Symmetry: D3
Subunit: 157 residues, 6 copies
């Protein structure tokens, strides 16, 4: 059985992330989405809220599961019998930064990273920019899953 981990803060999950999840679940026997908890930045949504939002949006992916993770990612991956990470990239400068992390993760733990190019429609979407825009009344409903948008309006109120 093949498998990969899709890591991120997902605060909140976007349609870009979801596209990556779907494409991973289509090519690996199992996919684990790792929602990374950071004690430093606490973000807009709690880890449990983030997990629930992802589960709602991935309800039709039976071979994908969602968990919280903390600390060194390659430990999270290897603890679950896997040794691949799958991540989306939206630009060359994204690649450069992620490349050093991928080479580091391969060096320290033998864990591989597979990158997928963003769907063209979501090349400009990020969690941070979506939150920023929404905070000032901008409409980001076309960039987020249905599950997220309603919950986002709520947090803003």
């Amino acid at each position: 059985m093949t498998g990969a981990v899709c890591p991120g803060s997902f605060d909140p999950v976007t349609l870009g992330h979801l596209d990556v999840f779907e494409r991973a679940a289509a090519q690996f026997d199992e996919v684990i989405v790792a929602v990374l908890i950071n004690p430093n930045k606490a973000g807009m949504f709690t880890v449990d809220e983030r997990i629930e939002m992802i589960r709602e949006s991935t309800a039709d992916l039976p071979n994908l599961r969602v968990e919280s993770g903390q600390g060194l990612l390659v430990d999270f991956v290897r603890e679950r019998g896997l040794n691949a990470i799958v991540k989306g990239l939206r630009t060359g400068t994204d690649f450069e930064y992620e490349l050093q992390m991928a080479q580091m993760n391969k060096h320290i733990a033998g864990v591989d990273t597979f990158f997928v190019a963003t769907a063209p429609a979501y090349s400009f979407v990020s969690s941070s920019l979506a939150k920023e825009v929404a905070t000032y009344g901008g409409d980001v409903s076309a960039l987020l899953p249905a599950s997220v948008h309603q919950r986002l309006l709520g947090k803003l109120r």
Copy 2:
């Protein structure tokens, strides 16, 4: 039942390519190396020679096979009942160019592309630069598998 195609001209295969093959073979049930031939431009090596050099250096990968082709890569992929391409990247400029072809390939045929970061040792190795340096007498033995180096020197002489 998972699988991916690793495409290239492989004229000749490099250690960088072999690294990608090994990493693909580790993460997918089957891997097909697609030796893509330009029927209008002979390279340095014939199709038979390219395939032999790849086979000799992949003998320890039981789930990898090598086949040639031409025309649209996505047709090669789909006619084998697969839907994924695996390719290596070295730079951010690599990524921009490949992103465009990856997005085109997904658009016209639904085929996805997964990129892996080059092993650091091979980030400067290319088929073209290896051929160029060897043409002028530089030592490229450490960048090419054994199956390649002296065949290359033979071509040049």
Copy 3:
């Protein structure tokens, strides 16, 4: 009386190009599309025709063929601005060199716009290549252009 020139080979014009034309047309009183003679699929007249067909709804745009220095083309028509679309940061680096050169020699400025997201991967070159091998590029090209491209391949 504002104006800009949108240059390119446009062989053929894509929906990515048309997007840039419309955006230029929305912000400048006068837009001239400059079809540059440089070697490819469509003749200059054919390219001009495909563009005119696809830009009928833009009253302040016209299409002309051009040769020689782009800056001469621009200045001989009383303008001093170029409008061009970009997809990547590598696009910017290459175009930046030409933009600074053009400003240096003739005082002609260049305004760049970011590609629409949907057309990130579309280029004349790649569309021709894919169509040549039977790939469907109908969603990447103006309706008129697409039929004409089929015709060339036959």
Copy 4:
């Protein structure tokens, strides 16, 4: 009636910025410099003042402070174009994301211009940093700004 907004923190405005203002002013009937309140050296009023002082020769330019979404600022003034300067391909990538977002949510377009070559290395941040340690940045800043910067450091 064409127009564009040139946004930034301008803390302080540099000769690189002023170059972009002049170039925008040359191609659009109306330019509004938007001084964004976000945390730094000069107050909003001070930044506005330094810009007005340095743009007296541009009759079709005015300077206003802004808060909230840039697209709201732009649309509430009847415009739908942003003009911004770029130095590198990395600049383009970051700005491209915001430009496509801004177009998506409000239909506001963005036009980028390449920096003048002489100002490739100038930024408000680096000029302040260097001046703070006694480096001479007088050739990188408008005459007025430079005196005012000295004053802040004293």
Copy 5:
């Protein structure tokens, strides 16, 4: 009488840095490693510790010396009667950022900057990423000189 300054925070020095030091020392009559301290931000290591770690791994470079400083790098350079800075680069984004500082430094003080490309093996090594990975238990022994690794582990414990 030729000479160059190799600047950095070196918190801690990496094998990538050491490679740059060695290459500078090979091409200039004297090299000064400038340990630049932010008087307002303690790093992980004190100035004395940073200098010791660099000295212990450069003992075989007779024409290299190590000194700390703060403020404008160009003043450090000129007060030693020198006019050149030598720095390593890994990426094109590295280059854009350093180009801006190099052009500023030439403008204000006439000091030139020479960049060298990272050794391929170290292209993913940074002081910050090494500290981050070690903080969470990853093995970074092969990216840091002997003079550094266990001191780092000691800091973390």
Copy 6:
């Protein structure tokens, strides 16, 4: 004695090249400008014309000499008792390409490469773009040494 080689086609030498030559001659005891002859592309100026133009523009650099070179650059460098190359860069994408060549040259012959950032005024100038512009009556006199411009007008007639 320290030294470096400054390689290029220099067809014709530009003020950007000259800035690099001056900065190299200021930091190394000797500099050799290697005018690379290519049998494929024959260019606008003969090798001897290119050498003469460079000598005129570098008349006040007594520690810089100009020679023609052919074949593998690292052989040219090592044959002259040197093991450094100095080259200018005008952008990050220039760096990426040159980086692979620098890593290759270091690998095959132990020859180092030092890069210098372009003077801001010449960031847009190249031999090719200068020739192209001049061919159609554009004025590139501010971008080329005095020696070149007159000779360029002549070739165009």
